[PDB]
Design an enzyme around this catalytic site. Structure first.
Site, PDB file in Angstrom:
ATOM      1  N   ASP A   1       0.068  -1.225   0.174  1.00 18.45           N
ATOM      2  CA  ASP A   1       0.362  -0.081  -0.176  1.00 18.45           C
ATOM      3  C   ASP A   1       0.775   1.370   0.018  1.00 18.45           C
ATOM      4  O   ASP A   1       1.564   1.322   0.668  1.00 18.45           O
ATOM      5  CB  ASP A   1      -1.429  -0.076   0.870  1.00 18.45           C
ATOM      6  CG  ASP A   1      -0.459  -0.328   2.502  1.00 18.45           C
ATOM      7  OD1 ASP A   1       0.234  -1.201   2.126  1.00 18.45           O
ATOM      8  OD2 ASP A   1       0.546   0.132   3.259  1.00 18.45           O
ATOM      9  N   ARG A  41      -2.482   2.383  -6.108  1.00 22.76           N
ATOM     10  CA  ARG A  41      -2.511   0.914  -7.075  1.00 22.76           C
ATOM     11  C   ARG A  41      -3.083   1.277  -8.149  1.00 22.76           C
ATOM     12  O   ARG A  41      -2.146   0.643  -9.090  1.00 22.76           O
ATOM     13  CB  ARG A  41      -2.030  -0.253  -6.110  1.00 22.76           C
ATOM     14  CG  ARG A  41      -1.308  -0.119  -4.948  1.00 22.76           C
ATOM     15  CD  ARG A  41      -1.089  -1.556  -3.899  1.00 22.76           C
ATOM     16  NE  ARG A  41      -2.515  -0.941  -2.962  1.00 22.76           N
ATOM     17  CZ  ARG A  41      -2.284  -1.151  -2.168  1.00 22.76           C
ATOM     18  NH1 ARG A  41      -2.002  -3.039  -1.719  1.00 22.76           N
ATOM     19  NH2 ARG A  41      -3.381  -0.975  -1.258  1.00 22.76           N
ATOM     20  N   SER A  42      -4.748   0.768  -8.137  1.00 21.34           N
ATOM     21  CA  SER A  42      -4.826   0.605  -9.161  1.00 21.34           C
ATOM     22  C   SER A  42      -5.074   1.294 -10.738  1.00 21.34           C
ATOM     23  O   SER A  42      -5.586   1.630 -11.641  1.00 21.34           O
ATOM     24  CB  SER A  42      -6.745   0.689  -8.978  1.00 21.34           C
ATOM     25  OG  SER A  42      -7.176  -0.336  -8.168  1.00 21.34           O
ATOM     26  N   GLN A  65      -1.232   8.004  -6.625  1.00 20.43           N
ATOM     27  CA  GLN A  65      -1.330   8.253  -5.012  1.00 20.43           C
ATOM     28  C   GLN A  65       0.495   9.234  -4.887  1.00 20.43           C
ATOM     29  O   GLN A  65      -0.176  10.192  -4.177  1.00 20.43           O
ATOM     30  CB  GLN A  65      -2.086   7.704  -4.132  1.00 20.43           C
ATOM     31  CG  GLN A  65      -2.026   8.401  -2.723  1.00 20.43           C
ATOM     32  CD  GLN A  65      -3.248   8.668  -2.650  1.00 20.43           C
ATOM     33  OE1 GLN A  65      -3.609   9.625  -1.868  1.00 20.43           O
ATOM     34  NE2 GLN A  65      -3.913   8.718  -3.451  1.00 20.43           N
TER      35      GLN A  65
END
Ligand SMILES: O=C(O)COc1c(C(=O)O)sc(-c2cccc(NC3CCN(S(=O)(=O)Cc4ccccc4)CC3)c2)c1Br
Length: 288
Positions: free
Chosen positions: A181, A221-222, A259
């Site tokens: 993450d 991550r997507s 992100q």
């Protein structure tokens, strides 16, 4: 050197990765997400600050509440479309599979672990053994048909059954289990070997609905997975792409794609390395 490799070096030697990411954050268009903020939809959102835009959200057809935290990302110049969604909650797993059925989705790409850093990031929405997983709210059942465990990812063969009409459909579940993450994959080779395993399965082809890409929030991550695959498809057409503009265009469909600045830098590395298109990646990945 290509026009992407020259920009990558200038961004590296001049240390302009975070200002470039801050530029993308400031140039990001804001769009209404009113449906996500309805009081009835509070238990359907994993995070308060991650919502799908109203104009691009995926609707659950014929349900009492058609809301799900999922955005349809359309890239017309690439002939490609993804559904970026959050990690399903225990009460939205039924909506997740209703969406997969209604959108004729063939592949589910999972880039997160169920448990990450003392926190549950996603509900166990598919069975791990031979027991049937019932979703009675939407009338669906999921069975584990086969699973292929590699070193850093696992491919599950799932049977999605409409328990009312008896119709069944096979789903390819690609689970990237070593992507931390707010982090990056181990190397561009391990990511590209995973991305091309998804491509080689034919589940991104126009004979199927849009694939469902999801991590925890469905933007971090997507977004890194979606930006690389989209850019690799655009460059195959022969276009000199602007990675910054392709990302800002994708961010109009779902907020906050990619992100961290390191996730953005890794996107440049994976696009550059994937531009040379493989067997080398499989070996460098050490999947066996
Ligand atoms: O997969 C990963 O790598 C990490 O995944 C994760 C999480 C995890 O895996 O635990 S949590 C999380 C998260 C939760 C709440 C808020 C934000 N951050 C906010 C920051 C502000 N933005 S935004 O998009 O910049 C708001 C905005 C919208 C439109 C225009 C301008 C700004 C939304 C997300 C992030 C993200 Br993403």
């Amino acid at each position: 050197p290509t026009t992407i490799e020259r920009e990558f070096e200038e961004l590296d030697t001049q240390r302009r990765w975070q200002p470039l990411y801050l530029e993308i954050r400031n140039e990001s268009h804001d769009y209404p997400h009113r449906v996500a903020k309805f009081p009835e939809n509070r238990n359907r959102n994993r995070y308060r600050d991650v919502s799908p835009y109203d104009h691009s959200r995926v609707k659950l057809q014929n349900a009492e509440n058609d809301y799900i935290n999922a955005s349809l990302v359309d890239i017309e110049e690439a002939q490609r479309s993804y559904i970026l969604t959050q990690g399903p909650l225990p009460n939205t797993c039924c909506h997740f599979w209703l969406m997969v059925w209604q959108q004729k989705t063939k592949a589910v790409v999972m880039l997160n672990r169920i448990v990450e850093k003392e926190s549950v990031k996603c509900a166990q929405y598919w069975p791990t053994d031979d027991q049937e997983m019932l979703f009675k709210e939407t009338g669906f059942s999921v069975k584990l048909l086969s699973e292929d465990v590699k070193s850093y990812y696992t491919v599950h063969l799932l049977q999605l059954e409409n328990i009312n009409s008896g119709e069944t459909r096979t789903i390819s579940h690609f689970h990237y289990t070593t992507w931390p993450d707010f982090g990056v994959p181990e190397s561009p080779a391990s990511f590209l070997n995973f991305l091309f395993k998804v491509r080689e399965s034919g589940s991104l082809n126009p004979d199927h609905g849009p694939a469902v890409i999801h991590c925890s929030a469905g933007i971090g991550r997507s977004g890194t997975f979606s930006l690389v695959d989209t850019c690799l498809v655009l460059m195959e057409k022969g276009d000199d792409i602007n990675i910054k503009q392709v990302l800002l265009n994708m961010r109009k469909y779902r907020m906050g794609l990619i992100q961290t600045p390191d996730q953005l830098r890794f996107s440049y590395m994976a696009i550059i390395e994937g531009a040379k298109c493989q067997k080398r990646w499989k070996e460098l990945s050490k999947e066996d």
